[PDB]
């Protein structure tokens, strides 16, 4: 198989970078601040313009002290170490990274089309062919990531950006981890957690395949398979072993989803002897040309409205706050390898 060999060469390049990560590849003054694109508890994402090239980028700025307070040191180090080492068509690229007295900076490619989340909510739901086009890209991305011993752990429409060709660009490697055995961290988004995560069990890459079932259901239905007003209520629905499907779902889609949203780990698609091939060879994907999807040769169902290289209409507005850089170095030892 040429997929097996593509993956062999992809692991060769990844391991060299994983072992000798790039550090300090730019500095703040090389960038001009334009607008806040997003905010989080320990950081924010800014639209910025690179002075030397005129290129626009999405600069993620993390407050080191807030990362330390939230016990996300190791997760942040994983995120940067992984991002600088990976290379795949459906992943947002890390262009530069650096740190100063106060913050960590990850300069990513800017995807002006916004999150799938906004388009999905506005439209209501995607047709089966539209959902299939997006899902196929996640299938190939997880096959790529998992082959590098990486678990992604944060699949959701909020983390899937739509590029100018209408293809997905996966963002947020905050929970990504290189692990060969099982792992135990309680992390992810309530609607998307596999039962083994909720039940505090050791888990592996099968949680990403469960999250794919949640994503495909949400794209095709317009709502998640398990939802409620509070997370505990969502968890009780996830572990119950029951899923209801809208009447408009095709028999092939329901069959695929029963195999992905499988509470039993020995029966979950992507986790069996055939691995990812049980998904790729499923009836719902019969129409999918996996190589054409990878090559970006398939016509996209939706092309976002292009109104300039640095336009921001596909993103909400946020209060424009100061980027403070202290005169004293904060948390130096904790982020030494960043």
């Amino acid at each position: 198989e040429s997929v097996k060999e593509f993956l062999a060469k992809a692991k060769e390049d990844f391991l060299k970078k994983w072992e000798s990560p790039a550090q300090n590849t730019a500095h703040l003054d090389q960038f001009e601040r334009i607008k806040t694109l997003g905010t989080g508890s320990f950081g924010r994402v800014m639209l910025v313009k690179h002075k030397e090239t005129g290129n626009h980028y999405a600069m993620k700025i993390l407050d080191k002290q807030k990362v330390v307070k939230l016990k996300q040191i190791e997760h942040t180090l994983n995120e940067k170490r992984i991002l600088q080492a990976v290379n795949f068509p459906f992943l947002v690229k890390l262009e530069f990274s650096f740190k100063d007295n106060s913050n960590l900076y990850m300069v990513m490619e800017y995807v002006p089309g916004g999150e799938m989340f906004s388009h999905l909510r506005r439209i209501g739901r995607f047709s089966e062919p539209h959902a299939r086009f997006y899902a196929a890209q996640i299938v190939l991305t997880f096959e790529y990531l998992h082959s590098l011993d990486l678990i992604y752990r944060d699949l959701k429409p909020e983390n899937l950006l739509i590029d100018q060709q209408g293809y997905i660009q996966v963002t947020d490697f905050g929970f990504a981890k290189r692990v060969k055995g099982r792992t135990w961290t309680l992390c992810g988004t309530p609607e998307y957690l596999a039962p083994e995560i909720i039940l505090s069990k050791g888990y592996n890459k099968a949680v990403d395949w469960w999250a794919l079932g949640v994503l495909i259901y949400e794209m095709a239905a317009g709502y998640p398979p398990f939802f409620a007003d509070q997370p505990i209520q969502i968890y009780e629905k996830i572990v119950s072993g029951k899923v209801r499907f809208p009447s408009h779902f095709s028999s092939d889609l329901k069959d695929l989803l029963r195999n992905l949203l499988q509470v039993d780990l020995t029966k979950r698609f992507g986790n069996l002897k055939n691995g990812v091939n049980d998904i790729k060879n499923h009836k719902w994907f019969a129409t999918t040309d996996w190589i054409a999807i990878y090559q970006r040769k398939v016509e996209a169902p939706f092309i976002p409205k292009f109104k300039g290289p640095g336009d921001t209409s596909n993103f909400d507005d946020y209060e424009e706050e100061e980027i403070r850089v202290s005169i004293n170095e904060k948390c130096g030892k904790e982020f030494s390898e960043f």
Binding site: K71, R121, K156, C187, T189, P190, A221, Y223, A228, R244
Partner: peptide, 20 residues
């Protein structure tokens, strides 16, 4: 309808991750 019940819920906006 299930759609109506979702739209009237408090979880139709961008969903935050759990850390703990």
């Amino acid at each position: 309808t299930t759609y109506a019940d979702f739209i009237a819920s408090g979880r139709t906006g961008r969903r935050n991750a759990i850390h703990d």
